[PDB]
Every structure is written in C-alpha cells, then in structure tokens.
Ligand binder design. Structure first.
Ligand SMILES: CCc1ccccc1
Length: 163
C-alpha cells in the first residue's frame, strides 16, 4: 500500500465525466474539473487539462497522468502551507499518506481549517485526534472514507485498506 493505491481505492477510476460526492463534474481518479453546474464548462476544463479536444472521455493512461499531477499538487500544497507543513513533517510515512488523502479530497485551505485536529496530530495524541477529526462536515458527508483515513491517522497502519 502507498498513497497512489490508497487514493485509487477511495476515488475509483471512471473514464467519462461524472459527478463527485458533492455533485461536481469530475473525471478519472477523482480529478475535479469544476464546481460550475455547466457540463460545457467541465468539458472545457477537461480539454485544457488533457491538451486535446475530448468527447468527455479519456484513456486510462490520461487518467493516471492527471492523478500523478494531482498527488504531486497535494504534496506541494502541504509543503507550501505554514499550518500544514510542520504537522506533515512531524508524521511518519503512513500518516503522511492520510494527510495527502485529505488534501486531495478537500484542498489545502480546507484541511488547514482542521486546526485543533492538526495540533493533536502533531502532539501524537492519536485517539484524541481521531475523535476530533470525526467532528466534521467531512466525516458526516463521507463517513466510510473518512473512517478509513481516520483509522490510518489513529494507527499508522494500512489496516483500513487491507482485504
Ligand atoms: C489534518 C491532516 C493533515 C496533517 C498535515 C498536513 C495536512 C493534513
């Protein structure tokens, strides 16, 4: 298990434009296209991202290319953020994957808002952090995924992604 496999499990793979859990146009492995309700706007974003005139459909290789870029962007974003970087630096590699997962799902600004959770994670108060993380819109709206990510933060193992 690693961050790519983890996010592939959590996000799935779809080669045609679909709506994500929030109703937003997305493609590939959780590549958000736009928050606009316009499918035409989403298609335009897709074409720009891929570099060709699509039919709203991409190949697996194209989906994986966007995914690579998106994981890289999530990490980059953490490292550029004054609130997130010190917590990320404090974590082991498994828990770092949980952090990347959250930023991939909700963005750098969104995760940086988990101030109290972040402090508990830096303090390595794992059970307390887990409880705090669950007191969130995130957990309520995507509880199964959040439970997997939280278990990863709680235990520093991949147990929630095995079997
Ligand atoms: C709240 C989890 C986290 C920790 C460090 C960096 C980003 C995200």
């Amino acid at each position: 298990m690693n961050i790519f496999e983890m996010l592939r499990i959590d996000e799935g793979l779809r080669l045609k434009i679909y709506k994500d859990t929030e109703g937003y146009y997305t493609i590939g492995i959780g590549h958000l296209l736009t928050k606009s309700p316009s499918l035409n706007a989403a298609k335009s974003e897709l074409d720009k991202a891929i570099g060709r005139n699509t039919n709203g459909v991409i190949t697996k290789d194209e989906a994986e290319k966007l995914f690579n870029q998106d994981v890289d962007a999530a990490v980059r974003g953490i490292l550029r953020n004054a609130k997130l970087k010190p917590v990320y630096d404090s974590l082991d590699a498994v828990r770092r994957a949980a952090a990347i997962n959250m930023v991939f799902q909700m963005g750098e600004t969104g995760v940086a808002g988990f101030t109290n959770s972040l402090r508990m994670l830096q303090q390595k108060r794992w059970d307390e952090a887990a409880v705090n993380l669950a007191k969130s819109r995130w957990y309520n709206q995507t509880p199964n995924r959040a439970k997997r990510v939280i278990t990863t933060f709680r235990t520093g193992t991949w147990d929630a992604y095995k079997n």
